[PDB]
Design a protein around this ligand. Structure first.
Ligand SMILES: Nc1ncnc2c1ncn2[C@@H]1O[C@H](COP(=O)(O)OP(=O)(O)OP(=O)(O)O)[C@@H](O)[C@H]1O
Ligand SMILES: [Mg+2]
Lengths: 389, 273, 104, 104, 108, 110
RNA sequence: UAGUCGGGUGAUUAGCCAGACUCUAACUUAUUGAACGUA
């Protein structure tokens, strides 16, 4: 139906416009421009921050029979939502489910027909449940055009003779738009990250210069600080010259790291030895990342991965850190001194403005200046097993 | 017969397709005759697939309420099977009824019998299945001052008393599990709450903030751009017929819009179309 | 390796190409194909195969077409299981065989 | 670690300070010294032990003697040995879930 | 309650009234369980003559004791540890000043 | 022979194989083995000969089993044209399967 | 503030008037089937 898709696309519906692109001139100059400007339009507001005309951000999650919960709903605030509870309630299951739903976005931007993460038939379904299957329903939003992007990661219990299909097709469709439009002409893609407790690890001792290595091990939990160090050494080698977007990428990541982390003031690479190692000016003393403390190291291995994934995934954005995405953090207080805990988010959501941070914590002092609309609170008595604060 | 169907695809208004199975002619006539022979009990709130009561009435059932809720049954038609039909009949010779009524989408699954959207008899059986479901749901709703309708996969509730529809979703699920075992299930992803602060609408008909049915500003602007084009004759044959059909729909749902369009340009213009 | 995978296990997915090495770095195509034809007797004189691999971020998932080779390997496996039949002996020997030197 | 090693077997040798990381970067001496002092009750009372590492030796004999006493006494007859344990953030690790049968 | 269920020998713990496994356990519940059960095993093995092996001696060091622990649990960790390990010497570092409130200033 | 870091973001080795300017991965495997042997020997001999204008003129005994391993015949026919000219004072004890290398060695040394 | 309902101008946009805000829209599927029209 060229006519009905034509009418929808002329109204503003992005999906119909992309479908018209997939039929006309692709076996057109108008519908391609519509689709690309839909995912590329924006304005610089009073604060000098680029803002999308269409914002990509999760809107609703519904955990039916998923781990502890038997039913739950979180209106992810569009931008910042801190789930404050205390151990045993499910603040990690929520981020786990969200990351596994974003894994299909990532898989289907990596390749059409791809495959994303999957709930588990051994540890993701409530043991007391009678259904014997878990359903992480979700709905995203990408503007007036695609106001509702549903997804449903569902999984049955091991041994039950009743599968439960997953409804990831809308995710396939939106990721298809992203990938195809990116190929035809360069666009800025959405950043997806999961920083759970696994990001705390010893500093043990792909090309890393692509744009689609921003998705490698992105929703696993630890990030890749190995990849960041490799890529940063790469940037340093490629940009010494006289002493270029590689130089700008390097400067952006340097400023991001030296601003988010207070202990770290500088970071650079030295190879006067035969090692080619990264030096960090921590606490006023130049050291190596092995010598960093457990809370100066994860506080770096988070911001560094984010900045990396957002400079080489939003190439055309004047300030790549203003790009879009959905970042989950499982315990923002990990290894952080309480004074640090009191200003983590205020600065984290100040150089990554357009990112939807779904953060979780158990320290009530993290929620220092955080508005009450952003806080979801499982009541200690009315535990998380009931459909905010 | 159960296997006497023809399958095809019809596209979607945004992306993707839907799969339909239109029956054969002989069984079509047989099931129509069966429908005539015995009329099935049906609840009044089921304002869909019945004589007279159309989309306008179903949407107007909630016109005079400020808080709106509704849920969508997940996989409505394809869930119904012989067991549901016979349990419904029992609660208030038979093998050929199973043969006539149902569809077999799999060449091997002789027992995988479901209603198809194409089947002309599908609406009657769908309404019949939920006669006690509607009974109890509407009884509970009117006990708590709630107006409930169902447009065939759209269970709509409305009320003026705040913080009452909140218990309704759960209620639904419970009743479902009592009636149709655990076969037909709700779609928690689609459940929507709205008020006079958001974009209420029932079965495509918008409900404005003045408790009257409306076409929505979207359409009221779309088919008036179309009218402004017809003014200069920039449409086509199929496009002109499309505008005619949309104007007829707007006349049915919102006659005031047609009167205002007439006052906008003229009367003869809309008589022509 | 696909013949081996399917003769051993039913539905076996033999080795796939690599998006990182087995694709020409400078190719407007942005995918790599490794096609190959086989000859097995008077019947089935042409058993084709393609191992395809496209870079990350390409619209069409350039995909290996291994159906006929899989079908022949499955014929091998099934007819062997029914009755014992001598089977092909594929092997590879690179410069790594210059290396120093469970009943189940 | 010296005390611990010297109990498993005679003449053991516990770990030592690292050379790259355990020495102060701005040290004017280029070596790191870690001088511990234990009290074994009133019988043996003071027990010094100093580890060292250059960018210098370590006096670990008293720990060797005390651990040798523990080891020989345990060998002759069962006693209650101390319990030396360290727990750092590395105890925060995923449950491996993979049991192994190590045969006692 | 903690027990072992037979045919893969699962470790089942009644966490908050529900029988879960070590996988279905929070990151703080499991980490504290680890830091406790490790010492229990070590001291049971190294004190085979004591009628209550948890009374044995030694030096136990714990860095960032409040790791993966919410404020209520931080307020009683060391006290329970000292109650089950009366004689073990404990050297415990931390950065959250709400575990100190349940100790004498002599030990700070 | 050079190392190209300060381009390409990685450290690659580059040679002039046959008049080209390529990476050492493009070199034949036998050429790579011979390259590694020669570089190792040169490094050892410059380490052990600090007081010497040309450290390559130091003494010693070098054994080479199958000096022509993995080398194409065109390379075999040139291997030993420069062993002595660059390592005059060291006793070479080589073993070989190829006659093509023998077409550059006197019978006195066989 | 934000979203939302949708009275006119202008021509699916822009843009002027009103308004109201239970934690809380997301406009759907054709040839069946109702309902609209049309013939
Ligand atoms: N499959 C499951 N079945 C029943 N309960 C589960 C299941 N999975 C998790 N739980 C519950 O999860 C609780 C642990 O909390 P959870 O790991 O889900 O998030 P959190 O504790 O708030 O955050 P974090 O794990 O990072 O500390 C367990 O007490 C357990 O009761
Ligand atoms: Mg620490």
């Amino acid at each position: 139906m060229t006519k009905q898709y034509e009418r929808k696309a002329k109204g503003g519906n992005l999906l119909s416009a992309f479908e018209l692109y997939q039929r006309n001139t692709d076996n057109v100059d108008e519908w391609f421009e519509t689709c690309r400007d839909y995912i590329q339009d924006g304005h610089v507001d009073e604060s000098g921050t680029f803002r999308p005309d269409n914002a990509f951000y999760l809107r609703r999650l519904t955990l039916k029979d998923f781990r502890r919960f038997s039913l739950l709903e979180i209106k992810f605030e569009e931008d910042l939502t801190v789930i404050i509870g205390n151990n045993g309630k499910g603040k990690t299951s929520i981020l786990y489910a969200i990351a596994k739903t974003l894994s299909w976005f990532v898989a289907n931007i990596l390749k059409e027909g791809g495959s994303g993460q999957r709930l588990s038939e051994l540890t993701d379904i409530k043991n007391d449940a009678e259904n014997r299957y878990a359903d992480v329903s979700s709905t995203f939003f990408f503007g007036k055009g695609l106001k509702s992007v549903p997804i449903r990661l569902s999984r049955s219990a091991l041994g039950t003779a009743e599968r439960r299909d997953s409804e990831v097709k809308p995710a396939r469709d939106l990721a298809d738009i992203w990938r195809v439009i990116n190929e035809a002409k360069t666009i800025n893609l959405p950043t997806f990250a999961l920083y759970n407790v696994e990001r705390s690890q010893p500093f043990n001792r792909g090309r890393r210069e692509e744009r689609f290595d921003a998705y490698s091990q992105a929703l696993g939990g630890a990030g890749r600080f190995d990849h960041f160090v490799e890529w940063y050494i790469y940037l340093h080698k490629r940009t010494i010259s006289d002493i270029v977007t590689e130089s700008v990428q390097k400067s952006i990541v340097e400023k991001s790291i030296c601003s988010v982390v207070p202990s770290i003031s500088k970071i650079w690479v030295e190879m006067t030895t035969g090692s080619d190692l990264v030096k960090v000016t921590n606490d006023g003393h130049d050291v190596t990342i092995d010598q960093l403390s457990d809370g100066q190291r994860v506080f770096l291995s988070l911001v560094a991965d984010l900045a990396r994934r957002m400079v080489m995934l939003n190439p055309l954005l004047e300030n790549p850190l203003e790009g879009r995405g959905i970042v989950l953090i499982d315990e923002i207080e990990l290894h952080l001194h309480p004074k640090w805990q009191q200003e983590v988010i205020l600065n984290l959501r100040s150089v990554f403005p357009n990112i939807q941070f779904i953060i979780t914590t158990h320290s009530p002092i993290v929620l220092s200046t955080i508005e009450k609309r952003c806080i979801r609170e499982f009541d200690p008595n009315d535990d998380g097993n009931q459909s905010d604060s | 017969a159960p296997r006497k169907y023809k399958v095809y695809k019809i596209p979607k208004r945004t992306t993707g397709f839907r799969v339909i199975a239109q029956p054969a002619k002989g069984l079509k006539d047989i099931q129509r005759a069966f429908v005539q022979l015995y009329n099935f009990p049906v609840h009044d709130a089921s304002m869909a697939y019945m004589k007279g009561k159309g989309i306008r009435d179903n949407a107007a059932a909630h016109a005079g309420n400020q808080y709106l809720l509704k849920a969508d049954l997940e996989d409505f038609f394809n869930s119904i099977t012989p067991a549901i039909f016979w349990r419904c009949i029992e609660m208030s010779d038979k093998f050929f009824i199973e043969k006539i009524l149902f569809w077999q989408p799999i060449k091997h699954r002789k027992t995988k019998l479901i209603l198809s959207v194409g089947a002309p008899s599908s609406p009657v059986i769908s309404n019949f299945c939920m006669y006690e479901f509607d009974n109890r749901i509407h009884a509970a709703c009117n006990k708590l001052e709630i107006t409930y309708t169902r447009y065939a996969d759209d269970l709509t509730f409305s009320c003026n008393i705040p913080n009452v529809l909140k218990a309704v979703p759960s209620t639904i699920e419970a009743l479902l599990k009592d009636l149709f075992g655990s076969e037909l299930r709700l779609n928690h992803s689609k459940t929507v709450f709205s008020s006079k602060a958001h974009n209420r609408h029932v079965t495509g008909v918008t409900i404005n903030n003045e408790e009257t049915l409306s076409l929505g500003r979207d359409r009221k602007r779309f088919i008036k751009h179309l009218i402004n084009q017809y003014k200069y004759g920039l449409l086509d044959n199929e496009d002109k017929a499309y505008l005619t059909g949309l104007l007829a729909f707007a006349s049915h749902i919102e006659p005031g819009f047609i009167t205002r369009m007439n006052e906008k340009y003229s009367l003869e213009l809309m008589e022509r179309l | 390796s696909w013949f081996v995978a399917n003769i051993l296990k039913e539905g076996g997915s033999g080795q796939r190409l690599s998006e990182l090495t087995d694709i020409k770095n400078d190719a407007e195509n942005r995918y790599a194909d490794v096609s190959s034809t086989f000859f097995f007797g008077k019947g089935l004189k042409s058993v084709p195969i393609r191992l395809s691999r496209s870079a990350l971020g390409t619209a069409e998932r350039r995909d290996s077409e291994v159906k006929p080779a899989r079908d022949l390997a499955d014929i091998w496996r099934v007819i062997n299981e029914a009755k014992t039949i001598n089977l092909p002996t594929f092997a590879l020997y690179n410069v790594e065989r210059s290396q120093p030197f469970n009943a189940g | 670690s010296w005390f611990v090693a010297n109990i498993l077997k005679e003449g053991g040798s516990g770990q030592r300070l690292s050379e790259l990381t355990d020495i102060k970067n701005d040290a004017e001496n280029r070596y790191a010294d870690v001088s511990s002092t234990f009290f074994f009750g009133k019988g043996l009372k003071s027990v010094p032990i100093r580890l060292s590492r250059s960018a210098r030796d370590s006096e670990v004999k008293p720990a060797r003697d005390l651990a040798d006493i523990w080891r020989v006494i345990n060998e002759a007859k069962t006693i209650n040995l101390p319990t030396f344990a360290l727990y750092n953030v590395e105890r925060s690790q995923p449950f491996n879930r993979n049991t192994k049968d190590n045969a006692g």
